[PDB]
């Protein structure tokens, strides 16, 4: 919790989406893996409706490209007002913003509907309404007064839950927490890191829960979800970095049942 | 009749072609926006692109005819050749390619082409690697002049005969008139294999178009003029397809009224 105060987002950014890991030209890599589950996903048709809330966007968007073509309303978020910022650089063009563009680029290659990538981002933009302040770690992660309709039709969260839970039984009640913004028979699609202790983010040490695919799948079930998918990625010797120690990626397509 | 006038105006004409004009005006938005399907950039990379994919059109060595300081016609075709032979009139235009094939950060960006070539390839290519591979695969820079009988000169250094030619834009920009034309095809035939595959692509109707000071003169021709003069070639026509440009593309750089794709194979 107050490890995240020293949290910087440029070294989050280098760490995971510039090379090694952010090359997109091997098939075989992490990124590809991502957008490749994400993609396939959304193209079953069964992921649909009018909103959608990210859960702990951190400074990246690249979770969101295959979403927003689903969704006319899509929500942003995270704990951190310095990741609020860095996303709003790249939602309007503003200076320094992060180029994202090789993912842009990717997801249309891999979406395969001949579109160019300036015309998904442009669309991702402008279904993207607003960035909000969150905290999966209360029964209400978004507030009160909410700027966010609720329920939401379908959740999207990527590397958050084990991230900000010391334990199990941490990262269970915060599944619950987020599950609550969703609309029954809604769907979330959960991505994360499996088998990690810490990662770094600059000054940032951070301590994350170790968790594995079944303890995943449980805490899915408990939560209420029905899973669809669950897959994972074995992270290769090649993006062993030093960054952190994960093992692996799971991908899990649940839905709220 | 005697061919040196025409040839020696043309040539003259050219001393004024500007590289970085050309390219603003052809391969820069509106032309080059490639997010419009219907807008004329995509349809020649789409032509390309489905032409290749036949898995009919390969061999060892390709020859570009006149490929003046662009790339994007290769980008489908580099995967098909080991061997490829680039060619401009112009040291200029040379020079330019030069440019782009050491990676300078001067050079003119090719990347958005690179990219839509490798999203209607559909085989998950990133335009990074499609760019190393063409990089790689262009053995040569050479002189030309499609008006003498050998293009190339004598004792050239391109593999001949090649397997198979592209050409965009040359042919008809280069002739005075449609005599020229066909003798400037009869030239480039001559350094194709029987049975090998020339792509073109040119302008329909065109009589004008600007590179910056310059402006040169142009042979309109039509589509079935096209097609004849591939007859009268000795090639057979496998496809002839033709892109009528859309008034917002009619930006005053030249009067073209549509363009050209012919895919035609060398009889023998
Ligand atoms: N108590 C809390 N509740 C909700 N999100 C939190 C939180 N504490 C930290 N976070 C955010 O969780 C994120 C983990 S990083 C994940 C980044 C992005 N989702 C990706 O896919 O790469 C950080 O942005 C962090 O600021
Ligand atoms: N006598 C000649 N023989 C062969 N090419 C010539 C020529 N005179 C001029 N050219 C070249 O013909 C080109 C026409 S412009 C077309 C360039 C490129 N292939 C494209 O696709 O956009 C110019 O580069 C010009 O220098
Ligand atoms: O630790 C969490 N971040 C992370 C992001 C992408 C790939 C692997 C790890
Ligand atoms: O050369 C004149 N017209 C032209 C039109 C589109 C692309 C290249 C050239």
Not at 25 to 54: H, M, Y
Request: charged fraction near 20%.
């Amino acid at each position: 919790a107050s490890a995240y105060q020293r949290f910087e987002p440029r070294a989050y950014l280098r760490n995971n989406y510039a090379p090694p890991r952010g090359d997109l030209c091997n098939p075989n890599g992490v990124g590809p893996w991502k957008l490749r589950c994400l993609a396939q996903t959304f193209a079953t048709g069964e992921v649909s409706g009018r909103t959608l809330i990210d859960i702990g966007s951190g400074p990246t968007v690249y979770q969101l490209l295959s979403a927003c073509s689903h969704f006319e309303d899509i929500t942003m978020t995270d704990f951190l007002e310095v990741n609020r910022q860095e996303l709003g650089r790249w939602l309007q063009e503003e200076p320094g913003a992060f180029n994202w563009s090789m993912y842009s680029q990717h997801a249309c290659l891999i979406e395969g509907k001949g579109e160019c990538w300036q015309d998904k981002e442009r669309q991702l933009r402008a279904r993207v309404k607003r960035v909000l302040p969150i905290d999966v770690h209360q029964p209400q992660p978004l507030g009160a007064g909410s700027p966010a309709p609720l329920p939401a039709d379908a959740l999207v969260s990527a590397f958050c839950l084990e991230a900000v839970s010391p334990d199990l039984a941490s990262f269970q009640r915060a599944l619950d927490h987020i599950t609550t913004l969703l609309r029954p028979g809604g769907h979330l699609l959960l991505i994360g890191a499996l088998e990690e202790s810490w990662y770094l983010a600059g000054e940032a040490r951070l301590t994350v829960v170790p968790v594995s695919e079944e303890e995943v799948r449980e805490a899915l079930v408990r939560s209420g979800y029905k899973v669809r998918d669950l897959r994972t990625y074995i992270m290769p010797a090649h993006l062993q970095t030093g960054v952190d120690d994960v093992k692996g990626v799971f991908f899990a397509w649940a839905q709220k049942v």
